[PDB]
Enzyme design. Sequence first.
Site, mmCIF file in Angstrom:
data_model
loop_
_atom_site.group_PDB
_atom_site.id
_atom_site.type_symbol
_atom_site.label_atom_id
_atom_site.label_comp_id
_atom_site.label_asym_id
_atom_site.label_seq_id
_atom_site.Cartn_x
_atom_site.Cartn_y
_atom_site.Cartn_z
ATOM 1 N N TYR A 191 0.845 -1.190 0.000
ATOM 2 C CA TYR A 191 0.000 0.000 0.000
ATOM 3 C C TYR A 191 0.881 1.241 0.000
ATOM 4 C CZ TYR A 191 -3.905 -3.109 0.527
ATOM 5 O OH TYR A 191 -4.847 -4.064 0.274
ATOM 6 N N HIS B 120 1.540 -12.441 1.338
ATOM 7 C CA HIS B 120 0.490 -11.432 1.289
ATOM 8 C C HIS B 120 -0.598 -11.831 0.281
ATOM 9 C CE1 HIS B 120 -0.096 -6.760 1.432
ATOM 10 N NE2 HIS B 120 -1.229 -7.441 1.728
HETATM 11 N N1 LIG Z 1 -4.465 -9.330 3.465
HETATM 12 C C1 LIG Z 1 -4.030 -8.600 4.483
HETATM 13 O O1 LIG Z 1 -3.010 -8.903 5.094
HETATM 14 C C2 LIG Z 1 -4.808 -7.367 4.916
HETATM 15 C C3 LIG Z 1 -5.846 -6.730 4.187
HETATM 16 C C4 LIG Z 1 -6.643 -5.771 4.814
HETATM 17 C C5 LIG Z 1 -6.238 -5.243 6.024
HETATM 18 N N2 LIG Z 1 -5.065 -5.674 6.630
HETATM 19 C C6 LIG Z 1 -4.484 -4.958 7.813
HETATM 20 O O2 LIG Z 1 -5.548 -4.541 8.667
HETATM 21 C C7 LIG Z 1 -5.505 -3.109 8.871
HETATM 22 C C8 LIG Z 1 -6.919 -2.640 9.162
HETATM 23 O O3 LIG Z 1 -7.812 -2.818 7.998
HETATM 24 P P1 LIG Z 1 -8.454 -1.503 7.310
HETATM 25 O O4 LIG Z 1 -7.730 -0.295 7.823
HETATM 26 O O5 LIG Z 1 -8.552 -1.698 5.835
HETATM 27 O O6 LIG Z 1 -9.970 -1.454 7.815
HETATM 28 P P2 LIG Z 1 -10.754 -1.105 9.193
HETATM 29 O O7 LIG Z 1 -12.001 -1.858 9.165
HETATM 30 O O8 LIG Z 1 -9.646 -1.222 10.201
HETATM 31 O O9 LIG Z 1 -11.180 0.432 9.047
HETATM 32 C C9 LIG Z 1 -10.190 1.464 8.951
HETATM 33 C C10 LIG Z 1 -10.926 2.750 8.690
HETATM 34 O O10 LIG Z 1 -11.667 3.148 9.878
HETATM 35 C C11 LIG Z 1 -11.265 4.431 10.291
HETATM 36 N N3 LIG Z 1 -11.264 4.472 11.750
HETATM 37 C C12 LIG Z 1 -10.456 3.745 12.589
HETATM 38 N N4 LIG Z 1 -10.666 3.997 13.855
HETATM 39 C C13 LIG Z 1 -11.668 4.958 13.858
HETATM 40 C C14 LIG Z 1 -12.335 5.638 14.900
HETATM 41 N N5 LIG Z 1 -12.069 5.447 16.193
HETATM 42 N N6 LIG Z 1 -13.290 6.544 14.555
HETATM 43 C C15 LIG Z 1 -13.551 6.739 13.253
HETATM 44 N N7 LIG Z 1 -12.991 6.152 12.193
HETATM 45 C C16 LIG Z 1 -12.047 5.264 12.564
HETATM 46 C C17 LIG Z 1 -9.877 4.631 9.681
HETATM 47 O O11 LIG Z 1 -9.397 5.963 9.660
HETATM 48 C C18 LIG Z 1 -10.035 3.938 8.323
HETATM 49 O O12 LIG Z 1 -10.677 4.665 7.285
HETATM 50 C C19 LIG Z 1 -4.731 -2.567 7.651
HETATM 51 O O13 LIG Z 1 -4.092 -1.289 7.759
HETATM 52 C C20 LIG Z 1 -3.697 -3.692 7.469
HETATM 53 O O14 LIG Z 1 -2.558 -3.622 8.326
HETATM 54 C C21 LIG Z 1 -4.430 -6.802 6.146
#
Ligand SMILES: NC(=O)c1ccc[n+]([C@@H]2O[C@H](COP(=O)([O-])OP(=O)(O)OC[C@H]3O[C@@H](n4cnc5c(N)ncnc54)[C@H](O)[C@@H]3O)[C@@H](O)[C@H]2O)c1
Length: 318
Positions: free
Chosen positions: A58, A123
């Site tokens: 990313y 990944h």
């Molecule tokens: N295949 C993989 O390995 C894979 C794929 C997806 C995600 N991930 C991991 O998981 C993490 C989390 O997933 P994500 O970020 O896509 O989705 P998420 O469901 O964690 O949502 C994140 C979103 O919610 C918002 N948010 C977070 N806390 C908040 C709060 N308290 N109030 C309001 N808004 C809030 C953020 O700013 C962002 O837009 C990624 O950064 C990554 O490290 C891994």
Amino acid sequence: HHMELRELGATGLRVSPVGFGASPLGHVFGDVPRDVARAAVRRALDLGINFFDTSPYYGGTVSESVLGDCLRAAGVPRDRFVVATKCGRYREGFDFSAARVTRSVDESLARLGLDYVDILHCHDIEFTDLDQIVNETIPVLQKIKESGKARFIGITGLPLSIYTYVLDQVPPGSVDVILSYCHYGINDTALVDLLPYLKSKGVGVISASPLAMGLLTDNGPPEWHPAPKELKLACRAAADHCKKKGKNITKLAMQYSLMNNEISTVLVGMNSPEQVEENVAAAIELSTSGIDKELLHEVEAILEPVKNMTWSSGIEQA
Ligand SMILES: NC(=O)c1ccc[n+]([C@@H]2O[C@H](COP(=O)([O-])OP(=O)(O)OC[C@H]3O[C@@H](n4cnc5c(N)ncnc54)[C@H](O)[C@@H]3O)[C@@H](O)[C@H]2O)c1
Ligand SMILES: [Mg+2]
């Protein structure tokens, strides 16, 4: 009050139940200034978050450069935090071959400014033939593990079927952890069906995207979000239900994902100290006071029709 650390599989590691995903919504800490990134990570360290997940994908490897930047800037002992990165998925496409992941780990280490990472994952393996992961990638990552450059080895991806396919077909002990996302939150808890199996295999469990990539927020998901319209509409109804009562769906969702101690950490994408504070607070309030069960029950009823509804990912297999 601190957050209560959890044990991660059979790795020995003790991790915060809230973990820091360093790319929320497929962007390097959103798109916030560097000072703000640096402060989110600082604030996370200060508040007892000790788990950091990133990848070279990313933001075209800048997630790792920025996290590396943010970590050494915060100035904290190497053994005070746990870092995971990944290999195989790049902005130029997928390559899980031996030579690519071997150089990948070094590049990551260079960008992150570290000597080792705690976890290296393959990944989004649903994007390749899963036999390549069994027969090539996992073997190579053992050698990377042997070299010391990564302490533990992971697999990640969306469809829960990747995990039984791989873990059934590799010698016991080959894989230390998995990272699953979008399958442990109010709308989708299918990961639960794997926890006993993974425990039986000695594999630690990280879950991610407790808000389902923005479905369970007031703001709603990005336009690119792959959920079926039905799920999108249902989540909008849940968000509206919480709102009309002066309550916050984001908080309820974060707390909910934290209520299963068989998941060692829940990675939440966070872009600012304020988000750190809210999520750490949500965790602490869960611990000390518990969830709002009455609100939970009503939200569960709205989501009921779309429970565990998912979407396609990756390529056709064997
Ligand atoms: N295949 C993989 O390995 C894979 C794929 C997806 C995600 N991930 C991991 O998981 C993490 C989390 O997933 P994500 O970020 O896509 O989705 P998420 O469901 O964690 O949502 C994140 C979103 O919610 C918002 N948010 C977070 N806390 C908040 C709060 N308290 N109030 C309001 N808004 C809030 C953020 O700013 C962002 O837009 C990624 O950064 C990554 O490290 C891994
Ligand atoms: Mg095959």
